[PDB]
Amino acid sequence: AMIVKEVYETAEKIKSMEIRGAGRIARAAAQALMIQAEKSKAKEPEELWNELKVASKILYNTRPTAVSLPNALRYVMHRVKAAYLGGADLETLRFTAINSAKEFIYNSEKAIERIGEIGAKRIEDGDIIMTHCHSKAAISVMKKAFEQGKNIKVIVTETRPKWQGKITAKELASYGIPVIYIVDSAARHYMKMTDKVVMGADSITANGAVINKIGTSLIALTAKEHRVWVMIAAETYKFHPATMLGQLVEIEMRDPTEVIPEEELRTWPKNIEVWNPAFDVTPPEYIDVIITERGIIPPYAAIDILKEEFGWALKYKEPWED
Amino acid sequence: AMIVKEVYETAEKIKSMEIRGAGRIARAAAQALMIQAEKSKAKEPEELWNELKVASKILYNTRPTAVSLPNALRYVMHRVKAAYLGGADLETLRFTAINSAKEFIYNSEKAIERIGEIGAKRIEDGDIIMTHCHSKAAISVMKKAFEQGKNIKVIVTETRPKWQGKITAKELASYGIPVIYIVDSAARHYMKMTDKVVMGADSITANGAVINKIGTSLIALTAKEHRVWVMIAAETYKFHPATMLGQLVEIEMRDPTEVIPEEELRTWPKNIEVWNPAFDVTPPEYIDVIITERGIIPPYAAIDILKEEFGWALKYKEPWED
Amino acid sequence: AMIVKEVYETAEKIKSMEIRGAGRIARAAAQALMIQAEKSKAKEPEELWNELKVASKILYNTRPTAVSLPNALRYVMHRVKAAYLGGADLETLRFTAINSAKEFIYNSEKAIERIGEIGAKRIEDGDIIMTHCHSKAAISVMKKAFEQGKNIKVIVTETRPKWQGKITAKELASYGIPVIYIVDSAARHYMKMTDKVVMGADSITANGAVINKIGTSLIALTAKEHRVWVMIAAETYKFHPATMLGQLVEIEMRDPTEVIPEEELRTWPKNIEVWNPAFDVTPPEYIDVIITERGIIPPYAAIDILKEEFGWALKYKEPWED
Amino acid sequence: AMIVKEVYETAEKIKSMEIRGAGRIARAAAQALMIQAEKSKAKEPEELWNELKVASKILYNTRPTAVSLPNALRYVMHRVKAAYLGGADLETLRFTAINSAKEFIYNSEKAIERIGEIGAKRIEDGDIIMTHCHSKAAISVMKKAFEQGKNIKVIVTETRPKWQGKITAKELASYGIPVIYIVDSAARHYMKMTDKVVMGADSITANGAVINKIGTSLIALTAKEHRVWVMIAAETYKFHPATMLGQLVEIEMRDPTEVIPEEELRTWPKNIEVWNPAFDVTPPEYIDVIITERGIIPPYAAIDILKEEFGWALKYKEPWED
Amino acid sequence: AMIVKEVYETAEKIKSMEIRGAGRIARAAAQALMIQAEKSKAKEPEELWNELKVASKILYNTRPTAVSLPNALRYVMHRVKAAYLGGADLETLRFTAINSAKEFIYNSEKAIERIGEIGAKRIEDGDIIMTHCHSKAAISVMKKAFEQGKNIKVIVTETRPKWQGKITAKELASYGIPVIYIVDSAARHYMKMTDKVVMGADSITANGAVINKIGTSLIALTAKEHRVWVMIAAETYKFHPATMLGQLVEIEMRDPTEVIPEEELRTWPKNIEVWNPAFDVTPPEYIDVIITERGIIPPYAAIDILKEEFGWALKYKEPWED
Amino acid sequence: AMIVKEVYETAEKIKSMEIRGAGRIARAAAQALMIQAEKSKAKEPEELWNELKVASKILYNTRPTAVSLPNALRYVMHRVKAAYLGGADLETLRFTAINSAKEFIYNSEKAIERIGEIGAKRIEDGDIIMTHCHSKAAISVMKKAFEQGKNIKVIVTETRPKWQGKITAKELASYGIPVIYIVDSAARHYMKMTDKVVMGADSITANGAVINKIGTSLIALTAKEHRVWVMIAAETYKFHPATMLGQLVEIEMRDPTEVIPEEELRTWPKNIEVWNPAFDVTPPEYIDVIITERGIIPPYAAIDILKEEFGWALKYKEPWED
């Protein structure tokens, strides 16, 4: 097949984390399959069906842990596939794909704003919120509370290795919101002054567990220790279907040099391995609520979300396999 | 009034953390009083005594949290004050200062070795040990356990903001000990593969609480969650006598530029505040044993140590006070 | 505009807690709309509709915390609004109001009986049951379990400030049930001899949290400490629909004179403040089952109840709104 | 009244535990109803109906605790009863019984194989797994996982008093899976090396609680204590419908001679009572997942399995009742 | 013997709680034996030795739970007894007793002030302290913090049945300290805003447990749940010797009419018992520190306090028995 | 080198558990050293010294886990050694051995009777008590309490694999104390009716941990879970001095044939390993008190027993060493 440069570029930028955050990655992936259909030179349906099957594969093998990614691809390709198998002519298939992808992206933007409006009602005036990493969903909650005239402060953890915390700090500060920036080690120390914890998700499992940025389970643990509510702001497409049938989520191991720079690590002894997991898994008992765009749920209700929105596709193969 | 430059240099090097770690700061301060006494140009005992008090005050107003520092000064200065008030001539006072300093330095070095011999018996063949910061006492234990031919592997947390973990990592590696280097956020993610936690202490309170490097309480917290033994390696001069009479330990807040470099930090808006606590406080429920030069205690026996060795001095003011 | 006195009287009697308990306040409000509709002098459907909305608003602005109240009003008013907008004549609208009110009252009475039949199966011969406040639903369970010939004994907490326990105590005593009457402070002291806890609920949230009489969370807390089952007896109209979209329940602060009588309270200085929260919030981890007219659920299934029966109305404004 | 001898043999063998394990009991009760229809010499439909009703009672009154048994009889008799009331002639009734028994028995075999497939994905390479009793569903998970190439090892608790663990230890060994065999009391001592716990269920309640072999809750508790996953492998017919309406599962007390043999117990004084409860009840807070043949759920979702597969039957009486 | 009216009056006032609080009761008891020696008309030593033996017995059988009482008596009578057995003439014995009692009372007043100075160092500026009952020791801590210019607020629980909270509220408010008065049920509700808990003791056991006013264990439980420090301000004479040798402290049951007034309770049904325990027992794990006048200790160190101050008298009988 | 046959018989019987229970082992080892001195045909002092050293090694190398054994040998041999070095002649050395054995053996009997007296005060009328294994100290507490008139009942866990619980069940019955006998696995199921837990100890560490029969920690854990007191009845010679200097207690692994009999185990495949640990280790957080013959302590005070009765010996080598 013949793939546009924007599919390859998006894939490179996902791997390299130049494009990041699970929501954004998912949009970008959908935006890429969309450009593959805008610019395709295919002459018959099957040509295009193949181009999109292969673009999807390229995009799926970028970063494993956030299921937002394959859900975006599935949203586009369940539709694209059903068009092709119902003999849609070429231009019918091109629109299915473009339009499916415009839907997903639009709904993504809609879901986040909505998560913001819902989750803000759980923020009280004077609250001190602790967050982790950079999460567009968590930030929608925090930003919306602030706009309601609640007087909040946000404790931003710096989030090693990759410093996502700086993005979070600067962003919140530019909306007017007072920020307190601390190291990830300082979470328990400052949990006493924290009223709420608000974080994102990359994958939510059938049984309620939240895969999110490494260190998430620690902040959640000590929030529980102190009875601070842990609220996970997370779209429906963050929920992981394959977990319904027994699958464990893959925990992405990133390059050691994100931790110790190349210039330095090459000088270190050989009997030191550097391990850089990108995510950990917080158990549901440490979670108060998941704020989805369909409303507040307890974490154990993740399986209802999956039953009714994702269950069907499990008896089928992936809509890009052959 | 006529203080030598070695005193001034030590003070600067303790502030800047060029000289660092609780035990070594203690030794560096004994040492500084030693050099003050050795090089003094005083001709009257009253005049040397004055120098030693002023030097003590300078060394004391460097870093508050590690109680080892004022315990080192006290060890020297109780003995110097008793000699002075007993009517000692110049040269007898000069030697009390010097010889006391030397007693302390020698005792500190012996205590760490002994702590290693004692702690290492609680390490078992095959153990995976998680540690935090750079602690000579913690390292003595791991070091010795390896020398005994136990095959151990040490998980080393990077310890932000100042990166003390790099020191620990390279040091353990240098003795032959395999290391796994993780960011602080990953401590819960890797506690399932950890068999023991072994950290040091800056101060230990009357009720058994351990003030140590920021993040220590989190590691202890999830170690408890998992039933991993938390062993604190600590000399008796880590115990905090003022806490017997209700004093809380001051937690050092250090330069924000440690967290976010100056060059970057000036580009940030007013409404972000960087907060840099260098320590936190781990409760005694989360600590299995404290390993001292006199043996293994439960954290609650911290009061015994304080009683039998430090309490006698609490009726008197500080031996460097006018 | 032309509101009968029965509406005004009910409102006053709900405020003063002459009429009280979540379920009975709900019935008293249906009933009040019923009498408004029965006695209306309106000649146009638009005019009755106006009366019913104004009456609803008056009944709603009485006490906030028990969600039963606005669920009772909604049950009537959804049906009255659909009939009105469907073009009903005066007498058809009058009967929709009356007959809906009656449906609710009848359903409330049936639900409590059914809750008793269901809950009582979880009581066993010889049980010592601790309760709190006066809850008709809780009492239905204890009542029925005794009628089944189980020899039960009920520990009754006095329930300050308003002494609801006296009602419970005398009521249980009147059916033949032995009572042990303790102050609220003794709940932990007597939890070792307690086999079951059975309390009611004013509101129950989307994540399974139970808002109930002040002190409920303490009893639940130490019941958990001891592994005593905490069973919440509660009708479906206790479930809080606004919480599905992130609303927190308002906790009523009531007159300080309830706590400290007026006569005494005026002799106290400015700088004492009496605070009288009438409710508190028990987390779902501390609740074994919720017993509803439809059966036994785990607290987390509170969302199911809300979804299948209340969620449909959250896109529309309140059925008494202009 | 004309009951075939196969029915009486099944009943005897269920009572004396020659046939045992919740699923195998279910299949054996269905098999007996099947053999009753095949071998019946009934000339009228009404006459067969009476034999099956009566067989269903003989079988139900064997061992009470595993709901699998009554759920098997319900499966057959619900259908046999709906035929009989639609006026089915004799050979139509005989077939409804025979075929319903056959679907239940095939669906049982299918569910367990599929549990094995689903549950094996939560087993990771290297895993050490503790189990308890002998569960065909637990064993399916362990066996599949091994067949996938995962080098596992299984800790088999011996399971007093009836020694179920010997059956488990021989079986798993016979597939080439290395077994560690231990006494029940040693579960906590070896929970530190255990990665995963996998057990069966006899009945699962509406609120998530799991009834299973005596000891199961002790193992669940120490596994929670050590953050080891407890995974319950249970067919959907192990869920207990009566629990929806408040019922408590009866805990079978079996012969004391299973504990102390008869020749020894005869000599013991009267003032020693030997209590042999065959089951206990684990809270859902100590359960990570239930692995059913329709997927992985959190324990709290047991109510959904029940609501949608069994709730319908509750408003009627038992199909084998008059 | 012939006992002065002040021994009988003090005893009546202890029983009736007109004189109350464990410290005060102890002083008053000592003050009474003192007046029995001031006013005695005895002519020989043995006469007076008998008068004081019998006065002591009268005073001991007033209220059981606070050991401050018998420790006061023992302080006076261990001395008085050793005088008499070393043939002290009459006037020697009269002074021993008077002077012993003046010592105890003076030291009591000294210990409380001291407990105040120590415990205040654990109060931080801005703190919100929750307390319970009326405790002179707890109040010494709170008052002293306030005098140091710390800006505190105290949550006073009302303390049923006897309303000791009103005494506490009014007293603290008259020293200038802002008070928030709440019911005992509201403790968990307001534990989120509380920074510290400070309470008294009536008896402290060998193993660390604190007997204090009913409801104390509840406040401590939820303080632990929220990681609020529980600080028990308690003199050395609050520690219970008999617990060293296995004794459980008697939990005083007071008259039911303290709960339900006479006028009301006589009208209540016969199958309602009212139980009024005056104290409960908080376990040591819920206690951070005991502030004694000899300094801060962990609760497990209570046995050291008893070993060294009370151990000796245990091999002997009580100094008023014969 | 001339070792009497009584020594070899004691050693055999300790190894095969014909003599068992930590205290009874101690008495039997002392008895053997006693019979060695009595029957020795040694002509020089040096010759007897060698026989006792050698007997002490034979006895020490039987069963490692109960420190009672080495503490008995230490008791004798410390004294025998100090005599030998003061130049004691032959019959003086023979007597030091004989008498030291006799004091240890009488002090053992006295300690257990006194443990019984002290511990029985923590048993209240009506109490149901769970125990484990067969402990002579635990049994002293249960027996005394019964003799005081307290109507108790005892739950005897059976204690696999060696069936110790049968010995306990017969014994207590023989004193007229009603026994409930159960399998080990049923400890949690019956912990709800248990009021008190009372067990022995084989070794108690410096930090409070209790080593005792396999299962003891499972029972301690579920007792903590249900807020039931765990009371450990232990003579002061059960405290382990080596633990002060970092030692870990060795956990004896006994024959697999104790678990599965030899005639059965021979048939089992090789890929089943049977592990029979005879002890486990309970944390001090799950222990309410240790009841020694010098009083009730919290588990954390084990270090004081040790410091002041055993610490002296640590700087030397074993008295029976060269």
Ligand SMILES: O=C(COP(=O)(O)O)[C@H](O)[C@H](O)COP(=O)(O)O
């Ligand atoms: O874990 C991360 C970032 O992962 P990375 O930075 O490694 O991509 C975020 O908290 C979630 O992805 C949610 O973000 P959002 O709510 O914006 O989807």
Ligand SMILES: O=C(COP(=O)(O)O)[C@H](O)[C@H](O)COP(=O)(O)O
């Ligand atoms: O917290 C630190 C060092 O802080 P810093 O790096 O700020 O001095 C170490 O864990 C202890 O001080 C122990 O040191 P040691 O065991 O070496 O005495």
Ligand SMILES: O=C(COP(=O)(O)O)[C@H](O)[C@H](O)COP(=O)(O)O
């Ligand atoms: O908290 C209360 C009453 O508050 P108040 O006395 O302030 O109304 C009751 O526990 C519930 O409302 C249950 O009532 P029921 O079960 O009777 O509906």
Ligand SMILES: O=C(COP(=O)(O)O)[C@H](O)[C@H](O)COP(=O)(O)O
């Ligand atoms: O407790 C038992 C059976 O006990 P018993 O031996 O008393 O019947 C098993 O764990 C379950 O029945 C599940 O087994 P399966 O998964 O094989 O149904």
Ligand SMILES: O=C(COP(=O)(O)O)[C@H](O)[C@H](O)COP(=O)(O)O
């Ligand atoms: O329990 C009470 C009062 O008992 P009562 O009011 O029943 O006498 C107090 O908290 C303690 O006695 C300590 O008070 P103090 O520190 O003043 O001794």
Ligand SMILES: O=C(COP(=O)(O)O)[C@H](O)[C@H](O)COP(=O)(O)O
């Ligand atoms: O675990 C055992 C003995 O096991 P074993 O049977 O293996 O020796 C007993 O609980 C203790 O030794 C205490 O007994 P006592 O109090 O009688 O010393």
Ligand SMILES: [K+]
């Ligand atoms: K907080």
Ligand SMILES: [K+]
């Ligand atoms: K571990």
Ligand SMILES: [K+]
């Ligand atoms: K109980």
Ligand SMILES: [K+]
């Ligand atoms: K483990």
Ligand SMILES: [K+]
């Ligand atoms: K707080």
Ligand SMILES: [K+]
């Ligand atoms: K109990």
